[PDB]
Amino acid sequence: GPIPTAPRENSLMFLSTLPDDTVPAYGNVRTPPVNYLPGEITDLLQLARIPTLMAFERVP
Amino acid sequence: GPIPTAPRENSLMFLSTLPDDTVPAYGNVRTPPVNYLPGEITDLLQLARIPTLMAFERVPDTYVPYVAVPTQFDDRPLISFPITLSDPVYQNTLVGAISSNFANYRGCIQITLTFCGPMMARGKFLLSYSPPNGTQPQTLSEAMQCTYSIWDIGLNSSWTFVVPYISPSDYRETRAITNSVYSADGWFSLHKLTKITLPPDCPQSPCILFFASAGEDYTLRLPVDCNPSYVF
Amino acid sequence: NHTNVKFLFDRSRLLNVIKVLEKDAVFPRPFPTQEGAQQDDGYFCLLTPRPTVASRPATRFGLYANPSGSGVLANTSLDFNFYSLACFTYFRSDLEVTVVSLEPDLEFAVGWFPSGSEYQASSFVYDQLHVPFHFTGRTPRAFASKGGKVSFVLPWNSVSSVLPVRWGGASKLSSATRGLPAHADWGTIYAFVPRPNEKKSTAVKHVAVYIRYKNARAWCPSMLPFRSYK
Amino acid sequence: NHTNVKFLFDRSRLLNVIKVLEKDAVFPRPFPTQEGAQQDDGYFCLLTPRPTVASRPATRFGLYANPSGSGVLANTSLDFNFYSLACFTYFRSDLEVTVVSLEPDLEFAVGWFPSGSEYQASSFVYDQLHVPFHFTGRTPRAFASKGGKVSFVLPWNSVSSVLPVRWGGASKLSSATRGLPAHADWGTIYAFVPRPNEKKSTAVKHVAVYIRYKNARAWCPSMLPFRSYK
Amino acid sequence: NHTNVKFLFDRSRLLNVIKVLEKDAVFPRPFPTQEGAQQDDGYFCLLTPRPTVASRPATRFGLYANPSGSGVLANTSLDFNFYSLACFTYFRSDLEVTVVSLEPDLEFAVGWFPSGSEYQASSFVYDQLHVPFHFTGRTPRAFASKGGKVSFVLPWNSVSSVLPVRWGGASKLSSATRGLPAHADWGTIYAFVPRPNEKKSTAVKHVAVYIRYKNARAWCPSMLPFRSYK
Amino acid sequence: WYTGRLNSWTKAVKTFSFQAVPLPGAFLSRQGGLNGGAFTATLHRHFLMKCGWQVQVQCNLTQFHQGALLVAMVPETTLDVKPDGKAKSLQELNEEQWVEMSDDYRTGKNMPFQSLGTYYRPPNWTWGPNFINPYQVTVFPHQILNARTSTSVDINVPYIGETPTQSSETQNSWTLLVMVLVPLDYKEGATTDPEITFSVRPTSPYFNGLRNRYTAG
């Protein structure tokens, strides 16, 4: 049947953190495999765990 | 296939009470559990059931939540009022306050009384209800024809009273812009049945208090927006 | 199947035309009313097929066939189509409301409350700007873009079991007029512009109203209006 | 079922009206504040039912019933409806925000950040055009066409387990005012125009704010405000 | 889960502001460049988080803190947020582009090409009307109504396996500057108006750019920028 | 079990007048001549606490006495401070002897607040969220005190709070108050102006942290 047009409350808007995707532009692409690179990172906790050195202003 | 665009009749509108949800903004959140807090609330009926104390303007700006039995005697009731939630007497009770935020109510009204006086004094009291008529009844004789009950001073100290729900409809107007059958439901009164006993050297002028609460079948309907006058 | 009451009473018809609010304003006061009051007229309308005068229930219908005179004129209305349609002592149904502008390229919102309540008056002041409180409340407020179109369905909202087409009782013991019902309505409707009162404009705006009955039922057939032999 | 707290606290109500940003601007500074500062007011608003003054938490509510005087006026707000509605020592729910323009045919965007953060100041210069940094950041920025309408739902964002309706403790060991909470809010909201500061205009713009509670819960009943016998 | 790189690098941020094309125009030429050339600037922008100058790759970042002087100024940019966010020697992800106008009620279209290509120059003449060839081509061209909004996702388009955050090699045997990468970009973007050059107008138009990373990955952690103790 | 002495009832006391004991804050000042001796100091060497309470009251009237007193546990109250923002002194307690009703308390008007400063205009304060509703006090856990049958007070309130635990020196979520329902009256000769005594017991406490004795800021 015809479009049972149900207008949306606040469409025609731009939102920064909209999770959904958008229309592809230049699909059907192939990429060079990158499995040869070691040292993959998952979360910042990996770097947060490694210790480092603090400092203090030189005593007068 | 392509969007079979079916335009909607009145889209691009903003509506106050639209039930559906909207787009999430900052999802993937975690919250601290709150199970440790007791005293959860489900519906306003929980607060509406708990009784409270009414009040009356001081007999000739200080309202009083108590009444003292006088030594003088007259056939007229000592204290009476219409059963209408808009009256000042309910204007601070929890039930009255909650009802003020609704279009209509439904159910019975529960009333409680308490005595506070001497040791070796006794007496009798009569409780009555009168549906609406030409004018409020005045004489205990006229009141006696209506529904009434006997409350003895000495048997107990709080002879609970409940006004039955009577009306020619399914509900009644919470507020009365103009007097109407569905709005007012007559009055309620108390009568001194016999002279009380004054024992040796005891103080005089005992004290009596009254409490109101919503009946088990009490129910409201049709929420509304509040009057913001109390800010002033 | 055309004869079915449901298949008949399911179409929209015009009801009345009203102006657009620009301030808190005072609500009309009951009759008889003396002069000098600040109550304004032509802004609030009650949802009822039965005759009404000055946004209040009425018994006798009138019309201003004589334009000249002195005093304040009044609004009136009656659902010609509904009354001529058929005969039914009793009736009940959900009332559907719709509004469309009558001015060039206008935007606004609409406000409603059910029976038994009354207009909320007074206004606040924000950063030296005065706004009536009727903007916000417990009841729905609707918003539409320019051009404008408003639609929604209201549920039954009156204490009485049904709506009496031709009633003959009385409502109160003293001074009550015989035959005048009490709450045969779905409430009151009003329109306003989301602008501060400080920016009021002289030009008046006007808007029409359309209603539609959904899921109608009837009882106790009756008579139909007479037509002359002139 | 009308008595259910959830069925009651699920409707939109107006909160406050604010102007539209046109530059980086300085954020208000805590109290007491001395004169000569460049902090500007009436651009930032905090999301909180409890009373607030000059976009900051407060304890006592005030109103400018006396217009005349000297100095800088301040903003205030309090959810009349929520406070009058019921009694609950504790409360928690997701806060839904919505905004609509109050000027003819305007377009803009809105910006928000949660509690604990603060406004980002300073501005860049592109090809001799100055733009505040608040345009871009880690947090959402919303865009709407002319006319305007903004809607979304924010999740709970405060460290405290619930929101205290009437609290009586203190927040810090020294100088802390008794009873003044710390983070009973959902953050701060602000509006701005996607134009360079170089093209600022004198005419002011104003915008209203509406909020709605979703999935409300309560604990520990309480009392209700008093009303006079005058 | 907030610490996840994917959950972090999935939000839009501003990149740069550019003017609107009105003619074929000459593309910028490599450095050093002598005076008298017709190459125009501020119309083409390259998609790259790393620092760039005059729409070309660069190594050292600069800023025009001193306004006065003589000569031609240049554009610059760097993703402050991305660089401050975290440490990763290598990175790859699809780049999402979005554009919004910065002028009142404007309509236009956008044009793009990937890396390795270059702007197509020259123009045709139809019935005494001159139109640049860049209107039509092998690559996408997007069209939007007045007001304007453009969105789409570009796939990875560079020969290199990943994007190096801090590279230290060289690209060519002779004269190549150490550490300057070759094709760490997603191409170039540009905007234009679908009108003949014969109807050019003096008033300039400006437009902003927003980008977003999708499906990000990283390798070989690194250090973070220093902050002063001043 | 800590015990304390309050001021003595007199017929001069009006109605709706009151006095309150904010626990555990009153301990710091040893309100009503009360010295726990162990918990009082143990709080100082710790910072975070989580415990319940259990209270009691007493007032001896006689055959020829009449009156009515209201006692209840009202949480999150802030009535134990002067309008400026300072707690009252022992001299002030001995002077007032009772808290009399006022429109300020009815409206929450004069509760402590921060002065705006020289930058702002002076706002007109009208209302606050810590108002007092004299009539609806009965909603919270409470009991009556009638001269004919007033024996004693008893209550046991579970723990409450915006968080599972709070700082001792600042936390205040429970408070005991007494209200004069009916003004006291009696025939001369029997007990005149009976005294009021209060007892307090915490339950299931959990003291947290460790440090030297707390030092004033």
Coordinates of C-alpha atoms in Angstrom, one line a residue, chain E:
Chain E
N1 CA 34.1 -0.8 28.7
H2 CA 34.8 2.9 28.2
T3 CA 38.5 2.3 27.9
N4 CA 38.0 0.4 24.6
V5 CA 39.7 2.1 21.7
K6 CA 36.6 1.4 19.5
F7 CA 34.2 2.8 22.0
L8 CA 36.4 5.9 22.3
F9 CA 37.1 6.7 18.7
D10 CA 33.5 6.7 17.4
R11 CA 32.4 10.4 17.6
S12 CA 32.4 13.4 15.3
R13 CA 34.7 16.3 15.7
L14 CA 35.3 19.5 13.8
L15 CA 38.3 19.6 11.4
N16 CA 38.5 22.8 9.4
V17 CA 36.5 25.6 7.7
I18 CA 36.8 26.3 4.0
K19 CA 35.3 28.7 1.4
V20 CA 32.9 27.8 -1.5
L21 CA 34.2 27.4 -5.0
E22 CA 33.0 29.6 -7.8
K23 CA 35.3 28.7 -10.7
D24 CA 37.8 26.2 -12.1
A25 CA 40.7 27.8 -10.2
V26 CA 44.4 26.7 -10.0
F27 CA 45.6 24.1 -7.6
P28 CA 48.3 25.0 -5.1
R29 CA 51.8 24.1 -6.2
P30 CA 54.6 22.5 -4.2
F31 CA 57.2 24.3 -2.0
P32 CA 59.2 26.5 -2.3
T33 CA 56.8 28.6 -4.4
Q34 CA 57.6 31.9 -6.1
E35 CA 55.3 34.9 -6.4
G36 CA 53.1 35.8 -9.3
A37 CA 51.4 32.4 -9.5
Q38 CA 47.6 32.2 -9.9
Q39 CA 47.2 29.3 -7.5
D40 CA 44.5 30.2 -5.0
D41 CA 44.2 29.0 -1.4
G42 CA 41.5 28.2 1.1
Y43 CA 39.3 26.0 -1.2
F44 CA 40.8 22.6 -1.0
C45 CA 41.5 20.6 2.2
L46 CA 43.2 17.2 2.7
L47 CA 41.7 14.6 5.1
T48 CA 44.5 13.9 7.6
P49 CA 44.9 14.3 11.4
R50 CA 48.5 15.1 11.0
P51 CA 49.6 18.7 10.6
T52 CA 49.3 20.3 7.2
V53 CA 50.0 23.7 5.7
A54 CA 48.3 25.3 2.6
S55 CA 46.4 22.1 1.9
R56 CA 49.6 20.0 1.7
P57 CA 51.3 17.6 4.1
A58 CA 53.7 19.1 6.6
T59 CA 56.0 18.2 9.5
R60 CA 56.2 21.3 11.7
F61 CA 53.1 23.0 12.9
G62 CA 52.8 26.8 12.8
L63 CA 50.4 29.5 13.8
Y64 CA 49.9 33.2 12.9
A65 CA 50.1 34.7 16.3
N66 CA 51.5 37.8 14.7
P67 CA 48.8 39.2 12.4
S68 CA 50.8 42.0 10.7
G69 CA 53.2 41.4 7.9
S70 CA 53.3 41.1 4.1
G71 CA 52.7 38.1 1.8
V72 CA 50.2 35.4 1.6
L73 CA 48.8 33.7 4.7
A74 CA 48.3 29.9 4.9
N75 CA 45.9 27.4 6.5
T76 CA 46.9 24.9 9.2
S77 CA 45.2 22.2 11.2
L78 CA 45.8 19.3 13.7
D79 CA 43.5 17.0 15.5
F80 CA 44.1 18.2 19.1
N81 CA 41.6 15.7 20.5
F82 CA 43.0 12.7 18.6
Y83 CA 46.6 13.5 19.5
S84 CA 45.9 14.1 23.2
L85 CA 43.6 11.0 23.3
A86 CA 46.2 8.2 23.4
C87 CA 49.4 6.6 22.1
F88 CA 49.7 4.4 19.0
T89 CA 52.5 4.1 16.5
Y90 CA 50.1 2.7 13.9
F91 CA 46.4 3.2 13.1
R92 CA 43.8 2.4 10.5
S93 CA 40.1 3.1 10.2
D94 CA 37.4 4.2 7.8
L95 CA 36.9 8.0 7.7
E96 CA 33.4 9.4 7.8
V97 CA 32.8 12.9 6.5
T98 CA 30.0 15.4 7.3
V99 CA 29.6 19.1 6.3
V100 CA 27.3 21.9 7.4
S101 CA 26.9 25.4 6.1
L102 CA 28.0 28.5 8.0
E103 CA 25.9 31.0 6.1
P104 CA 22.2 31.9 6.1
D105 CA 20.0 29.6 4.0
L106 CA 22.6 28.3 1.6
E107 CA 22.5 25.4 -0.9
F108 CA 25.5 23.7 -2.6
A109 CA 27.1 20.4 -3.3
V110 CA 30.4 18.8 -2.4
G111 CA 33.1 17.0 -4.4
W112 CA 35.8 14.6 -3.4
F113 CA 38.6 12.5 -4.9
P114 CA 40.9 9.9 -3.2
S115 CA 44.7 10.0 -2.7
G116 CA 47.1 9.9 -5.6
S117 CA 44.8 11.8 -7.9
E118 CA 44.6 15.6 -8.4
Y119 CA 42.1 18.4 -9.1
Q120 CA 40.7 18.4 -12.6
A121 CA 41.0 21.8 -14.2
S122 CA 39.7 23.6 -17.4
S123 CA 36.1 24.3 -18.3
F124 CA 33.6 23.9 -21.1
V125 CA 31.3 26.5 -22.7
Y126 CA 27.6 25.7 -23.2
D127 CA 25.4 28.1 -25.2
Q128 CA 27.8 30.9 -24.1
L129 CA 27.9 29.7 -20.5
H130 CA 31.2 28.5 -19.0
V131 CA 31.2 25.6 -16.6
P132 CA 34.2 23.8 -15.0
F133 CA 34.5 20.1 -15.8
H134 CA 34.7 19.2 -12.1
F135 CA 30.9 19.1 -12.2
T136 CA 31.0 15.6 -13.8
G137 CA 33.5 12.8 -13.4
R138 CA 34.1 9.3 -12.3
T139 CA 33.8 10.0 -8.6
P140 CA 30.8 10.8 -6.4
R141 CA 29.2 14.2 -6.4
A142 CA 26.6 15.0 -3.7
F143 CA 23.6 17.3 -3.8
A144 CA 21.5 18.7 -1.0
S145 CA 18.6 21.1 -0.6
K146 CA 18.8 24.6 1.0
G147 CA 20.0 24.7 4.5
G148 CA 22.2 21.7 3.7
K149 CA 23.6 18.5 5.2
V150 CA 26.0 16.0 3.7
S151 CA 27.0 12.6 5.1
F152 CA 28.6 9.4 3.8
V153 CA 31.4 7.0 4.7
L154 CA 34.6 6.6 2.7
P155 CA 36.6 3.3 2.7
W156 CA 40.3 3.1 3.3
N157 CA 42.0 4.4 0.2
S158 CA 45.8 4.5 0.8
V159 CA 48.5 2.1 -0.3
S160 CA 50.2 2.0 3.0
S161 CA 49.0 -0.8 5.3
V162 CA 48.3 1.6 8.3
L163 CA 48.6 5.2 9.2
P164 CA 51.8 6.1 11.2
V165 CA 51.3 8.4 14.1
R166 CA 55.0 9.3 14.4
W167 CA 57.1 8.2 11.4
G168 CA 60.8 8.7 11.0
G169 CA 61.8 7.4 7.6
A170 CA 62.1 9.1 4.2
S171 CA 60.0 8.8 1.0
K172 CA 62.5 9.3 -1.8
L173 CA 66.3 8.9 -2.4
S174 CA 67.1 12.5 -3.2
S175 CA 66.0 15.7 -1.2
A176 CA 63.3 13.8 0.7
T177 CA 62.7 15.3 4.1
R178 CA 63.1 12.8 6.9
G179 CA 59.9 11.8 8.7
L180 CA 57.5 13.3 6.3
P181 CA 55.0 10.6 5.2
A182 CA 53.6 10.2 1.7
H183 CA 49.9 9.2 1.5
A184 CA 48.6 9.3 5.1
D185 CA 45.2 10.8 4.1
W186 CA 41.8 9.8 2.7
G187 CA 42.0 12.3 -0.2
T188 CA 40.8 15.9 -0.6
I189 CA 37.4 17.6 -0.3
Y190 CA 36.0 20.7 -1.9
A191 CA 32.7 22.6 -2.2
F192 CA 31.1 24.4 -5.1
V193 CA 27.9 26.1 -6.2
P194 CA 25.9 24.7 -9.2
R195 CA 25.9 28.0 -11.0
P196 CA 27.8 29.2 -14.1
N197 CA 31.0 31.2 -13.5
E198 CA 29.5 34.0 -15.5
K199 CA 27.3 34.7 -12.4
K200 CA 30.0 34.9 -9.8
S201 CA 29.3 37.1 -6.8
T202 CA 31.7 39.1 -4.6
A203 CA 30.4 37.9 -1.2
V204 CA 32.4 35.0 0.2
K205 CA 30.8 31.9 1.7
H206 CA 32.3 29.7 4.4
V207 CA 31.7 26.1 5.5
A208 CA 32.9 23.9 8.3
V209 CA 33.9 20.2 8.2
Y210 CA 33.3 17.4 10.7
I211 CA 34.9 13.9 10.6
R212 CA 34.4 10.7 12.5
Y213 CA 36.5 7.5 12.8
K214 CA 34.8 4.1 12.4
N215 CA 36.4 0.7 13.4
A216 CA 39.7 2.0 14.7
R217 CA 42.7 -0.2 15.7
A218 CA 46.2 0.6 17.0
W219 CA 49.6 -0.9 17.7
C220 CA 52.9 -0.3 19.4
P221 CA 52.0 2.1 22.3
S222 CA 53.9 5.4 22.5
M223 CA 54.3 8.6 24.6
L224 CA 52.0 11.6 25.2
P225 CA 52.6 15.3 24.8
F226 CA 54.3 17.2 27.6
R227 CA 52.5 19.9 29.6
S228 CA 54.2 22.8 31.3
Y229 CA 54.6 23.6 35.0
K230 CA 54.1 27.3 34.4

